[PDB]
């Protein structure tokens, strides 16, 4: 009876998650009405995006084994007075992640309290390197374990950066080897032409990354919902917990 007694709870949570994603789709459809003020739509979509991003991340991690997307945030995202929005549910401070994460290859969306950016992270015994994609459409400034920023010809957008960062993370997964190469370059700090090579590669990476937000969001939601239908009980419990936490 407990195979059933537990199947009821799972079905319940599953229906919660499904109903939520469907509700989000509804809101998005209403916000894209001919009547709607687009600025108002952006403002409204802030909360929608914050709420659905964890679920999108879970789903997309399932659909693309190896993506290993993790939501991360920085110090300013923990300042209640300054941050525009609280970090999404399940978000971890980047420090804690660097210290605790199982070694390997990750994609990330990093929230700094204002904007979210895509990133590729590699944790070795050698150390950890973080490659941050930075939509700019600070010369010779480095930050920190090793971090490198790749300037890309993409409009920096407060309202679009979550979905855009998700998309870019997917593309980084698609260009896994290029980013691995840059990780090795970033690790090989010793080489005399490092500074050049790095910079060179930076440019190149940028290009490969740039080679609508609304449509992408819709598609991601559909994929997420259809995944939630067939999703296993652990995943269901997880997503449900994230959803509950977001409120």
Residue numbers in the entry: 146 to 282, 296 to 302, 305 to 371, 449 to 484
Please give me the paper's original passages concerning this structure:
The Yersinia outer protein J (YopJ) family effectors are widely deployed through the type III secretion system by both plant and animal pathogens. As non-canonical acetyltransferases, the enzymatic activities of YopJ family effectors are allosterically activated by the eukaryote-specific ligand inositol hexaphosphate (InsP6). Among them, PopP2 produced by the root-infecting bacterium R. solanacearum acetylates a conserved lysine residue in WRKY transcription factors to inhibit the expression of defense-related genes. Both the binding pockets of InsP6 and the acetyl group donor acetyl-coenzyme A (AcCoA) are located on the interface between the regulatory domain and the catalytic core.
To understand how InsP6-binding induces the structural change of YopJ effectors, we crystallized the entire acetyltransferase domain (residues 149–488) of PopP2 in the absence of InsP6. The apo-state PopP2 structural model consists of a five-stranded β-sheet sandwiched by αD, αE, and αF from one side and αC from the other side and a helix-bundle formed by the αB and αA from the very N-terminus and αG and αH from the very C-terminus. The catalytic triad, including His260, Asp279, and Cys321 residues, are well preserved in the structure. On the other hand, the entire regulatory domain (residues 377–447) was unable to build due to its missing electron density. Structural comparison of the apo-PopP2 structure with that of the InsP6-bound PopP2 reveals that the catalytic core is well conserved, giving a root mean square deviation (RMSD) of 0.5 Å over the Cα atom of 248 aligned residues. The most striking difference lies in a segment ahead of the N-terminus of the regulatory domain (residues 351–375), which is able to adopt two entirely different structures with distinct sets of packing interactions. In the apo conformation, this segment exists as a long α-helix (αF) that is packed against αE and β5 mainly through hydrogen bonds and hydrophobic interactions; by contrast, in the PopP2-InsP6 complex structure, the same set of residues are folded into two antiparallel β-strands (β6’ and β7’) linked by a long loop (Lβ6’β7’). Indeed, it is apparent that αF in apo-PopP2 would sterically clash with the first helix of the regulatory domain, which harbors R380 and K383 residues that directly interact with the phosphate groups of InsP6. In the apo structure, only a short loop (Lβ4β5) containing residues 296–302 was built with poor electron density. The C-terminus of αG is too close to the Lβ8’β9’ of the regulatory domain and RRS1WRKY in the overlapped structures, suggesting that the stabilization of the regulatory domain by InsP6 leads to disruption of the C-terminal helical structure of αG to save room for substrate binding.
